[PDB]
Design an enzyme around this catalytic site. Structure first.
Site, short mmCIF file in Angstrom:
data_model
loop_
_atom_site.label_atom_id
_atom_site.label_comp_id
_atom_site.label_asym_id
_atom_site.label_seq_id
_atom_site.Cartn_x
_atom_site.Cartn_y
_atom_site.Cartn_z
N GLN A 86 -5.35 -17.05 -2.59
CA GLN A 86 -5.50 -16.28 -3.81
C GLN A 86 -6.74 -16.73 -4.59
OE1 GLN A 86 -3.97 -13.51 -3.36
NE2 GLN A 86 -2.95 -13.43 -5.36
N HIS A 131 1.20 1.28 -5.79
CA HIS A 131 -0.18 0.81 -5.85
C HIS A 131 -1.12 1.94 -6.25
CE1 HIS A 131 -4.07 -0.82 -4.90
NE2 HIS A 131 -4.21 -0.06 -3.83
N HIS A 173 0.85 -1.19 0.00
CA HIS A 173 0.00 0.00 0.00
C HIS A 173 0.89 1.24 0.00
CE1 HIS A 173 -2.81 -3.12 1.66
NE2 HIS A 173 -3.56 -2.58 0.71
N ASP A 203 -8.84 -0.88 -8.00
CA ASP A 203 -8.13 -1.05 -6.74
C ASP A 203 -7.44 -2.41 -6.67
OD1 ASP A 203 -7.16 -0.32 -4.30
OD2 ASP A 203 -9.07 -0.48 -3.23
N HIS A 245 -6.52 7.16 -3.16
CA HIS A 245 -7.41 6.33 -2.36
C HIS A 245 -6.72 5.61 -1.21
CE1 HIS A 245 -5.79 2.98 -4.80
NE2 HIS A 245 -6.16 2.24 -3.78
N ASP A 246 -5.39 5.64 -1.13
CA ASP A 246 -4.68 4.94 -0.06
C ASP A 246 -3.61 5.82 0.57
OD1 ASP A 246 -5.64 2.41 0.70
OD2 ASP A 246 -4.94 1.52 -1.18
C1 LIG Z 1 -0.16 -14.64 2.86
O1 LIG Z 1 -0.49 -13.36 2.32
C2 LIG Z 1 -1.69 -13.23 1.69
C3 LIG Z 1 -2.92 -13.27 2.32
C4 LIG Z 1 -4.08 -13.05 1.59
C5 LIG Z 1 -4.04 -12.80 0.23
C6 LIG Z 1 -5.30 -12.50 -0.56
C7 LIG Z 1 -6.42 -11.87 0.28
C8 LIG Z 1 -6.03 -10.45 0.70
C9 LIG Z 1 -5.75 -9.62 -0.54
C10 LIG Z 1 -6.04 -8.27 -0.60
N1 LIG Z 1 -5.68 -7.48 -1.60
C11 LIG Z 1 -5.01 -8.04 -2.65
C12 LIG Z 1 -4.56 -7.20 -3.70
C13 LIG Z 1 -3.84 -7.69 -4.74
C14 LIG Z 1 -3.54 -9.05 -4.78
BR1 LIG Z 1 -2.48 -9.70 -6.21
C15 LIG Z 1 -3.96 -9.91 -3.82
C16 LIG Z 1 -4.70 -9.42 -2.72
C17 LIG Z 1 -5.12 -10.23 -1.62
N2 LIG Z 1 -4.99 -11.61 -1.67
C18 LIG Z 1 -6.86 -7.63 0.49
C19 LIG Z 1 -7.77 -8.67 1.11
N3 LIG Z 1 -6.96 -9.78 1.63
C20 LIG Z 1 -7.00 -10.18 2.93
C21 LIG Z 1 -7.85 -9.38 3.87
O2 LIG Z 1 -6.36 -11.14 3.30
C22 LIG Z 1 -2.80 -12.78 -0.41
C23 LIG Z 1 -1.65 -13.00 0.32
CL1 LIG Z 1 -0.12 -13.01 -0.51
MG LIG Z 2 -7.68 1.15 1.52
ZN LIG Z 3 -6.15 0.25 -2.62
#
Ligand SMILES: COc1ccc([C@H]2C[C@H]3c4c(nc5ccc(Br)cc5c4N2)CCN3C(C)=O)cc1Cl
Ligand SMILES: [Mg+2]
Ligand SMILES: [Zn+2]
Length: 285
Positions: A243, A81, A77, A212, A117-118
């Protein structure tokens, strides 16, 4: 003020040279100043510098202040991004044919919101968050030397501000879940109509969320490296399964629906699928 010098003078290359039209665009090779030129070009080729009488050194100073108020020590973030959410915003507007469905203040606000936005994100290890983001967005927009909206009238300015606020708050994944049922219900039965002011704001909220999280729709080597940047934030302060769940629950149905509205937004739907397949194969070891 040294950074302003070399950026305010440089010639901003064409959008085609900077490739910011591809949904498949990436930013790793670019320096910070290169992302600034790409940002000016986004404003420029969206006819924003023209229609709202933006002075070149205000936009340069406004961009550099937006970049300054992101934290380089935060893994994901960060300004990269923010830069990327604005780029996909641009690619969605041009390459996705979406430009013509929106007014100029709506486009001027969507882009300002995507960039901001961030702002001042500390990392998820610290819509409350998004209100702070807008406050940051408002401070810089009123900081002297940065007031890029000065060319706007008073009810021009009032409208743009309201849309900027709605859009930064829209990036709250909570508000996404609350309001996406209505957006999906509406597309479900040929009932979607942008001329309804409510459906328009709802669409702007969906479009923000689509940009986003647009990193998930990237070419696999880039989306893999972004997902690495995401993991560095999350525990450094299994992955293939999380994922697929994130894609299943959050990303897919949104990019599905956006593809309906704009069939040229399909690269986002397609790229998200290509990443789900790669993540699904990995999850099985
Ligand atoms: C082990 O580490 C992770 C944990 C969870 C995740 C999952 C879910 C994750 C998440 C969020 N944004 C992302 C943006 C881009 C990409 Br590309 C993947 C995303 C993403 N992926 C926010 C929501 N969120 C949450 C709350 O856990 C990926 C990884 Cl590496
Ligand atoms: Mg945000
Ligand atoms: Zn964002």
């Amino acid at each position: 003020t040294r950074e302003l010098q070399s950026l305010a003078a440089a010639v901003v290359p064409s959008a085609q040279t900077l490739k910011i039209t591809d949904f498949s665009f990436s930013d790793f090779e670019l320096s910070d100043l290169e992302t600034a030129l790409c940002t000016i070009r986004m404003f420029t080729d969206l006819n924003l510098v023209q229609n709202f009488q933006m002075k070149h050194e205000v936009l340069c100073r406004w961009i550099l202040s937006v970049k300054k108020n992101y934290r380089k020590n935060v893994a994901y973030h960060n300004w990269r991004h923010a830069f990327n959410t604005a780029q996909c915003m641009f690619a969605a507007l041009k390459a996705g044919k979406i430009q013509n469905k929106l007014t100029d203040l709506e486009i001027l606000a969507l882009l300002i919101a995507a960039l901001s936005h961030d702002l001042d994100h500390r990392g998820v290890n610290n819509s409350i968050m998004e209100h702070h983001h807008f406050d940051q967005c408002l401070m810089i927009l009123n900081s002297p030397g940065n007031q890029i909206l000065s060319g706007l009238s008073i009810e021009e300015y009032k409208t743009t501000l309201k849309i900027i606020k709605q859009a930064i708050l829209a990036t709250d994944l909570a508000l996404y879940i609350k309001r996406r049922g209505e957006f999906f219900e509406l597309i479900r039965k040929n009932q979607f109509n942008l001329e309804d002011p409510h459906q328009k704001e709802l669409f702007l909220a969906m479009l923000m969320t689509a940009c986003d999280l647009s990193a998930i729709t990237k070419p696999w080597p880039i989306q893999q490296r972004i997902a690495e940047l995401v993991a560095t934030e999350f525990f450094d302060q299994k992955i293939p399964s999380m994922q697929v769940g994130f894609i299943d629950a959050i990303c897919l149905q949104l990019y599905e629906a956006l593809t309906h509205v704009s069939e040229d937004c399909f690269p986002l739907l397609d790229g998200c699928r290509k990443n789900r397949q790669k993540w699904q194969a990995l999850a099985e070891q």
